[PDB]
Amino acid sequence: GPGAKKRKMYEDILSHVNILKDMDPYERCKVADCLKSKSYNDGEIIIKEGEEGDTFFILIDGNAVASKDNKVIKTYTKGDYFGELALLKNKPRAATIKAQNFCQVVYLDRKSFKRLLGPIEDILHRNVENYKKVLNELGLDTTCID
Ligand SMILES: Nc1ncnc2c1ncn2[C@@H]1O[C@@H]2COP(=O)(O)O[C@H]2[C@H]1O
C-alpha cells in the first residue's frame, strides 16, 4: 500500500472529492489504503473510447477533457472522477478523456472500485443517468447509459 505517509495525503485529497462526500471517515480511509498514483503529459489519452476499461480515476491535479464521436462532452478539473461507467456496465469505454496539461490522478482497479465505492453506488448510478442530458443534447448515442 501507500504507507502511513502517502495514505494521509490521500485521505486529505479524498475529504474534498465530491463523489465521496457521502462516505464517512472510516469508509474513505479504506479507499485511501488502496489508491495508486500516476501522471499524464499534455495531450496524452487517459481513456480511449471503445477500449476495454478496468480502471476508475480521480483527477487530483490538472485539466482533462472528455469527448465522444469528436464532440466535447465534459471538461474536468481537480476533484472530478471518471472511468466508472465501463466498470458498472461491463461495456467498452464510452468516451475519450485527454490530458490538456500535466495531470495527476489516483486510481482503483475494477474489483477494488466495486468493493470500496460500494457505499455510494446509488450516487454513482444517479450520476450515470445524468450523463444522458448532454448526450441527447449533442445527438449522441445513449445506449452506453442504458
Ligand atoms: N455524457 C457522458 N456519457 C458517458 N460517459 C461520460 C460522459 N461524460 C463523461 N463521461 C466519462 O467518460 C468516461 C469514459 O470511460 P467510461 O465509459 O469507463 O466512464 C466514462 C465517464 O466517466
> Spatial order of the strands in the main sheet?
1-8-3-6
Helix fraction bin = 25-40%
CATH architecture: Sandwich
In DSSP terms, counting alpha (H) and pi (I) runs of 4 or more, how many helices? Answer: 6
Please name the fourth-level CATH homologous superfamily.
Answer: Jelly Rolls
Work out the count of structural domains. Answer: 1
Question: In this structure, how is the largest beta sheet organized?
Answer: 4 strands, antiparallel
| Name of the CATH first level | Mainly Beta
Strand content: 25-35%
Family: Belongs to the cAMP-dependent kinase regulatory chain family.
Binding site for 3',5'-cyclic AMP 2: 83-86, 93-94, 131
Domain Cyclic nucleotide-binding: 19-134
Protein name: cAMP-dependent protein kinase regulatory subunit
Can you characterise this structure?
With 146 residues, the protein is α+β, with helices and mostly antiparallel strands. The chain has a single domain, classed as Jelly Rolls. The protein contains six helices and eight strands. It has helices at residues 4-14, 25-32, 85-89, 110-116, 121-130, 132-137; strands at 36-40, 45-47, 55-61, 64-68, 71-76, 81-82, 96-99, 103-109. A four-stranded antiparallel beta sheet has the order 1-8-3-6. It has a four-stranded antiparallel beta sheet with strand order 2-7-4-5, with no helix packed on it. β4 and β5 form a beta hairpin. The termini are far apart. The structure holds adenosine-3',5'-cyclic-monophosphate. Adenosine-3',5'-cyclic-monophosphate binds next to β5, α3 and α6. 3',5'-cyclic AMP 1 binds at residues 24, 26. One of its GO terms (molecular function) is protein kinase A catalytic subunit binding. This is cAMP-dependent protein kinase regulatory subunit. 3',5'-cyclic AMP 2 binds at residues 83-86, 93-94, 131. Keywords: cAMP, cAMP-binding, Nucleotide-binding, Phosphoprotein, Repeat, Transferase.
